[PDB]
Nucleic acid binder design. Sequence first.
RNA 1: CCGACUUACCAACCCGAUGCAAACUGCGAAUACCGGAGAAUGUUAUCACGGGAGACACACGGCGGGUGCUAACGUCCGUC
RNA 2: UCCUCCUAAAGAGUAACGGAGGAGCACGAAGGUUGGCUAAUCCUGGUCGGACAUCAGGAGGUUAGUGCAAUGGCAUAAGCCAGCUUGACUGCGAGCGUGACGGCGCGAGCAGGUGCGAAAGCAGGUCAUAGUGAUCCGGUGGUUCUGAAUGGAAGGGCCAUC
RNA 3: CGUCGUAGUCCGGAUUGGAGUCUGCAACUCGACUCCAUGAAGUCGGAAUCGCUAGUAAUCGUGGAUCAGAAUGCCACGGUG
RNA 4: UGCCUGGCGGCCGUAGCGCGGUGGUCCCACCUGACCCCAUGCCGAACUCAGAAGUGAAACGCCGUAGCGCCGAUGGUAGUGUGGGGUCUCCCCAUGCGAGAGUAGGGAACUGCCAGGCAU
RNA 5: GCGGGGUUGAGCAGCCUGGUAGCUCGUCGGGCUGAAAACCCGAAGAUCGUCGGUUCAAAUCCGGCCCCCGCAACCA
Lengths: 76, 66, 136, 177, 116, 52
Amino acid sequence: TRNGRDSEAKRLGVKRFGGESVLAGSIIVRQRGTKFHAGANVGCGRDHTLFAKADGKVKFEVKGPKNRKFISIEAE
Amino acid sequence: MKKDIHPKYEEITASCSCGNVMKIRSTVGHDLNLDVCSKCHPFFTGKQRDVATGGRVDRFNKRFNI
Amino acid sequence: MLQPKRTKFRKMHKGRNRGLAQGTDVSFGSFGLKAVGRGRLTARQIEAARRAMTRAVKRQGKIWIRVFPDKPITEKPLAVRMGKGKGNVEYWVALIQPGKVLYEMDGVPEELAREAFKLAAAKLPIKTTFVTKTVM
Amino acid sequence: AKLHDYYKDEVVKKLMTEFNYNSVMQVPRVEKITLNMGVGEAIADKKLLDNAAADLAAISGQKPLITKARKSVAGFKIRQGYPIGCKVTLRGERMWEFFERLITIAVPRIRDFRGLSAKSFDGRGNYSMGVREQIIFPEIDYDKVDRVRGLDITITTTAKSDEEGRALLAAFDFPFR
Amino acid sequence: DKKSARIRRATRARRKLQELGATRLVVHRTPRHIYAQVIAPNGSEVLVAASTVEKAIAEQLKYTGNKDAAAAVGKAVAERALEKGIKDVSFDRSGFQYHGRVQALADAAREAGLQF
Amino acid sequence: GIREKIKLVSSAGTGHFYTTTKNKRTKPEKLELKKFDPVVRQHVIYKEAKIK
RNA sequence: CCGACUUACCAACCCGAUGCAAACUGCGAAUACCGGAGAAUGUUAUCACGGGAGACACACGGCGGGUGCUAACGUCCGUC
RNA sequence: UCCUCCUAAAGAGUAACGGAGGAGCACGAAGGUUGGCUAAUCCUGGUCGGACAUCAGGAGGUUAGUGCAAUGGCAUAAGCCAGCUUGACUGCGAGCGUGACGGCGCGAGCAGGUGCGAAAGCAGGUCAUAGUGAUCCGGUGGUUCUGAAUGGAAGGGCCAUC
RNA sequence: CGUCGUAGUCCGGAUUGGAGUCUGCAACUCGACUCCAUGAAGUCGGAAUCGCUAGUAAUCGUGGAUCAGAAUGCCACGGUG
RNA sequence: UGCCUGGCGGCCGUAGCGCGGUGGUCCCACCUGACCCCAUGCCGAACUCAGAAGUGAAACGCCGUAGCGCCGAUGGUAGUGUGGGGUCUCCCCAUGCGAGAGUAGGGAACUGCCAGGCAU
RNA sequence: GCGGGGUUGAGCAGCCUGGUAGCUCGUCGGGCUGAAAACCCGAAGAUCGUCGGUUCAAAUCCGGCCCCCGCAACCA
Ligand SMILES: [Zn+2]
């Protein structure tokens, strides 16, 4: 046959969920596209990884006219 | 318009064969002599009879009689 | 013998056949043949049943077929070991869940429809029943 | 300029009374005149595309835009990005001058000219007509041209319907039929 | 269509200013009038607003839609902001080209005291 | 893998060099860029040279 | 050149009705997983470091499946 | 050996000679910044021109496009066009992700200097995920770091690289 | 004597449209000729092949038989050569 | 404090299309002109400047309208955690959660800050 | 099961990095011979085995299929 190949898993997914206290610089989700968009206090890395810029609790919300999922770091 | 990319364009005088003179702006530079204008072209008097449909029976009657 | 003109992929997983059916009511015709059992109808079975019921009604009225065999069923060649990749496609089936109306028919009398559906059902693996169109 | 002021008084009065318009701005007006020259043979030779550009610049006093193929097509053996045409957009004063020059000089010199077609108004009042020979424009020199080309004029107006555009063009004594 | 295109042009820089939490000076330019306002980092409340439709600013100008008028409204908005303590803002061109009237308002506000 | 690698030598006289790749068949002309030279702590012009 | 009608023929797009999909989703659970707070229970049951290992042939049964004939006390995973 | 979907049981991971396809490159611009723009397809009209070239208008709303396979993204466009340029910088890095390990990956911010922009700012390569080889031995350049009595040198170290 | 100046041409006249003349009861198939308009191919011809030794070949017109009309054919005749 | 207009939001279709009507004192839009500032891979169309003769025609705003898009119960169905059972490819019972589609119905947005014009 | 092949009527090149089809015999029409061969001149010809797929474009690239030619089908 010609179907024996496959690639190693990339271990994506949400790494820190909502209402979790995190330190600055910690990865929140590893994604391929921009499935979740960066909100307040969250930056977008080279491979679309959303990372916290300040210490606080993770906040998920749906915003915008396109109903996009935003991740922000609530103040703490 | 841009400064130098365009061709030379200024006023000229065009004189039709029927004496209808027109002053217009063009790129010829020199004056121009027209052989037919819009006011003299036969699209009001010449282009009516141009159909040349022809008749077979009137023509027949013209050639001879009984 | 019905079979898809094109397919996105050649082979398909074995799957399961749980749940109930969707086409419960007689939609187009006046009489239908409903399945009370569970299983898979092959293309050859569908073709044989269609021929039997058409001949039975002497090509009168109209007949609908609410199922279409779209699942490719493979099997390995004769006398080969268990590995060496999946087998080659041999026939096509349509997964049947209880309550699925298989065929419909109108333009003929009731008892003639009874006899035609019985002759058709006699060539099918699953158990069937006769149903009539209902308002609402 | 002549047809411009001619429009501004006579055409506006004529349209207001024959269409019973409530507002002056509702009267149709011509917005642009596009001059296209599709040169398919340019793929084989570049030396005849700058010539087409030159004679189009001569006809209307603007340097033309060398258009390019939007999408690749095999039937005419061209790839995306090849220059295959040249165009000119005329607006305002230049548009009016070219319009008067055309209507009073170019169209009477068309060989066997028996009137234009009134069935080329695209259903939304935008007229488009094609000429068969560029020699009808006195800007070019008949003996010094190398090949007889042809172009197509497009008169784009603000008229919503089809009869409004036809009436607007007729009001300038266009030679329809 | 033009207004939609202008909003589309401005809506990148507006999000960036909001993300940076900067108080922004928005300028709106129409053919006859020009308007300016300084809006808080939350984007839902303004702080100072000067414009040529105001009689107090209009009556000292020949025409409300020129470069001198733009300079006047820019200087006015800068003075009002400084009077209210707002002195560090970010300029939001709002889809217009940074040239002509908008550039005039900006450098007038700059020389008048504002910082951007 | 027709793209072969080269080195950009600094013009400041120091032996420092960057390294990259180039397609020598379609770009025969030499490469010149302004890059940071950490020895003199200034951005100087680097010129393409043979990788050796 | 234009064309002329109709012929138990096929048929794009659109509209109405009816199904199918592991590699379809304008919807969408139960579970499971991460984090915070509280009470009770459990011989710290949890984590870190150091000394010594063994093991890396697994089997069947239930549930979710691939492959096989929705064959096998068949084979390969997850979980108990 | 590496990448994409399903198998994979709605966090991660998960096997088979299971089902399907690709990679061993490319780019001095196809990278960075500023400013601007919106496709596919179809209808109508128009010279050569044709089912299909370029032009004008309409319907449509991303069914298009991304240097390439597939998946996830993308209108503030990551897609397309133009101007100026080298941040395809040097030393570092709070804190995480994934690995038995070797390792691989994301990263605000600090110091020096640079590009675009008026500026807020952005830029430590390319929309992201494949485009790859540990160590030994040897080659080139830089640096007194070392140099078997001493001063050199050879050899060795470190940095950059084959 | 004048014009054309190496060109598909003021070369070549085919083809076609319109208008006619003559013969013959009768010019549609199917005659000859004339007027106006039209101006194809053709720029010396492959393999091959024919006639001619002197007033000959080549070339230019004229007449006759047949015949109501209808030859670029046939049979004669001379000019240059 | 009432109406209308402009700018920036909250929210992201109960907020969007389509049909009919309506608006110019102010605002906004089309509009007039282009040596200049600036610009078209051609074009003052876009972008830009200097202005107010004309019109709300287009666009845009407001009002009305259920032809769509959209939201959407209650009840039932499918699925399922735990324990048990059968005729065990698939179901049933006790208990907890409970869709999607569809039905009645809802629905022509609501709201905050500032400025201008008209009345109180 | 694995390598190679399918191209004018027959035998065969070239499919080259995907825009482009060539040779011999044969065939057609004239020429030579009294006639037929041999010979001479001028011509013509293909949807590159079938069907899907990626391109603007497939005879070429990919996958499946049919036929032909080799290789292997062994230890029991
Ligand atoms: Zn005249």
